[PDB]
Design a protein around this ligand. Structure first.
Ligand code: NAD
Ligand code: NAD
Ligand code: UD1
Ligand code: UD1
Ligand code: MG
Ligand code: MG
Ligand code: MG
Ligand code: MG
Lengths: 335, 335
């Protein structure tokens, strides 16, 4: 089984690459390195002892994607390529909608042309907007998205559903990830964005090892116990294993929806404390205004994925923090 | 004032071109002729005695759209370019989403680059899905769209709203048209799709003049008085005049939403009868299965547009039928 992984050198993709390779799948990456390094793929290869076929370019480049599909026999696609910062998406909607919607459309056009009809889409808890209920299940209504990133994810889900309506020989798996954190136990690979991290834990990790000065905590006036945002953090290795479970167990036509989270919700301050326990010292933070697009609280009921895929997130917020900190200590500037 | 009209040689656009030109606006067309003829623009020029600057190509071609904006000083854009058949959209979702979403995104990218920040978007009663109430007002909730075409229109509206959030110096006018029918009184111009018409009235007109054999009536088991679909038909000349009213009266920043319809609902059989009265003979029809994506009944409350734009649709279903039939009699194969 050959798996094309778009955004193949990113955070979640590189952890997924490892887990796929370790189970005997073949892996091809396509990435433009907007938010990652090609070096991450060397580290995948080093950890696993296995190849990643590497293509360099944009998923919106039809000629490139035609070459990828012409040169390889692809069974599954995992579509990670996208821009993903909630706050940034509010200020740059067109950049988000172009990148995120059109990457998907060029991918699907080329897939259809080669009759490759099995896709895992990297969706997001953001599709639930302000959650109609907590914890969130796959029956919780979607919509009321609060930022163009989240909107783009919900739009993409609908586009994929419409593909199956027009051709029900497709297998479409919509994986709504919560908040992945952490690093591969080896410490050879972890979260390495370009520029200042837009997400919480890489920023916290960098402050803890002295690469950044101060954790910026966006809002303390949310309707949560300590007033900061509450999120379901999941170890990126558990999230990676979920992808392998999908491909191991789903070999039928249809549209399948799964929440991938832990069910445990942590506030921003509780994440900071987890890292402080891991580091053995204070991690400086400051309360700042709310970030546009942010909601108060979201966390998952992931029991559907356990039932149908045999999959559960085992790793704890301490494992997440320790592994993150191990990676960032060994690689303070990343790659 | 210079107005770029994308999809500038299509049905609604050519009627709009006339009304804009007759009020002293300058008009540029960009069109790929997927569903229209370049000859329609000669007829615009002939009716008005005024020029249309003609560009030939795809709105998704960034280099073309960059040339259009570099070569002209554009004040307003009216974005008609899209694929628009409900039933077809169900079978060809990706063609619809590519054409419709990416045309809009390339347009907006180029507009932003030249600081042209006034747009009228050709939206659609389809955004209301199965209407939560009748008649439909701009307060009726959107969503529950039943076909990728309608979905694409609702997605585009949200994208445009997100542009204004990121840059509230924009003027965005979302015009939700109901069902335009008819032709310019001259009979020199009218609805001329490529291939068999996908919409009702051009097909009815062609049957009436003997160009097609039999009106295919899609479903007679809807919850409507005669069981066929019910739509708010609006004379295309009234709809064109609505666009001029927007540009005459709206010169401020913001997002503005208007339903453009008559408030009168007609069944498919009542449309056929209107044409039979206009032709003076039976127009053969046959009851066929439901078309995928179709809803039972939609019609407009357009009083918001009357209030704010001084605009109202005056022309009746008889005017629509007579003018359609006048055009199709003089031009049985169109252009
Ligand atoms: N918390 C999370 O990190 C999270 C949660 C839910 C969903 N997701 C989704 O997961 C996917 C991956 O997230 P991630 O955290 O690994 O982010 P990431 O930035 O590390 O990974 C995305 C990769 O895609 C690449 N890329 C982006 N646009 C591209 C394009 N047009 N062509 C080619 N390459 C492109 C980037 O360079 C990057 O390596 C995204 O689609 C994101 O929305 C992420
Ligand atoms: N009942 C209606 O006809 C109706 C009602 C509501 C909304 N609308 C919207 O109005 C617009 C115009 O409708 P119309 O009835 O004039 O249809 P039309 O097909 O006559 O007009 C659209 C024009 O766009 C062109 N076009 C399409 N895609 C293009 C692209 N990518 N680049 C360049 N040209 C392109 C076609 O060749 C055509 O001339 C569409 O966006 C449609 O969804 C139509
Ligand atoms: C860039 C990124 O990885 N975004 C992902 C994250 O969303 P999400 O926006 O929740 O992720 P963040 O890591 O940016 O934010 C987590 C929490 O920390 C706060 N915060 C964040 C950064 C910071 O420097 N300071 C701070 O206080 C936020 O307000 C929020 O309450 O999970 C989603 C699924 O839920 C994914 O779809 C998003 O792609
Ligand atoms: C291709 C086209 O112009 N579609 C437009 C039309 O939708 P809409 O789908 O209503 O337009 P149609 O002209 O296709 O259908 C009108 C009615 O006639 C029926 N029918 C149609 C064709 C036919 O041959 N036989 C028949 O019975 C339909 O089932 C429907 O009840 O108005 C919408 C706004 O409301 C626009 O967004 C759509 O772009
Ligand atoms: Mg908790
Ligand atoms: Mg089980
Ligand atoms: Mg009526
Ligand atoms: Mg008034």
């Amino acid at each position: 089984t050959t798996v094309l992984v778009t955004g193949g050198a990113g955070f979640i993709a590189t952890h997924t690459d490892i887990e796929l390779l370790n189970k005997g799948y073949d892996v091809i990456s396509v990435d433009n390195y907007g938010n990652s390094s090609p070096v991450a793929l060397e580290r995948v290869e080093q950890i696993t002892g296995k190849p990643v076929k590497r293509y360099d370019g944009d998923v919106r480049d039809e000629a490139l994607m035609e070459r990828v599909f012409a040169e390889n026999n692809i069974d599954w696609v995992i579509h990670f390529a996208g821009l993903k910062a909630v706050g940034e998406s509010v200020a740059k909607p067109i950049e988000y909608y172009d990148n995120n919607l059109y990457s998907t459309l060029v991918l699907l056009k080329v897939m259809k042309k080669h009759n490759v009809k099995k896709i895992i889409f990297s969706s997001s808890a953001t599709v639930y907007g302000t959650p109609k209920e907590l914890p969130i299940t796959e029956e919780t209504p979607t919509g009321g998205t609060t930022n163009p990133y989240g909107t783009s994810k919900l739009f993409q889900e609908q586009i994929l559903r419409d593909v199956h309506v027009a051709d029900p020989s497709w297998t479409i798996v919509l994986l709504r990830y919560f908040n992945p954190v952490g690093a591969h136990e080896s410490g050879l690979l972890g979260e390495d964005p370009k520029g200042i991290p837009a997400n919480l834990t890489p920023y916290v990790a960098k402050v803890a090892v002295g690469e950044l000065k101060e954790v910026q905590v966006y809002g303390d006036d949310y309707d949560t116990p300590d007033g900061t945002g509450v999120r379901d953090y999941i170890h990126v290795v558990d999230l990676a294993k979920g992808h392998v479970a999908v491909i191991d167990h789903i070999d039928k036509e249809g549209v399948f929806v799964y929440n991938l989270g832990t069910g445990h919700g942590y506030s921003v301050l509780e994440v900071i404390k987890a890292y402080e326990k891991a580091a053995g010292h204070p991690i400086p933070y400051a309360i700042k205004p709310r970030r546009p697009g942010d909601i108060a609280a979201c966390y998952a009921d992931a029991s559907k994925a356990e039932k149908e895929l045999g999959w559960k997130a085992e790793l704890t917020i301490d494992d997440m923090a320790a592994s993150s900190l191990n990676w960032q200590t060994k690689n303070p500037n990343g790659f």
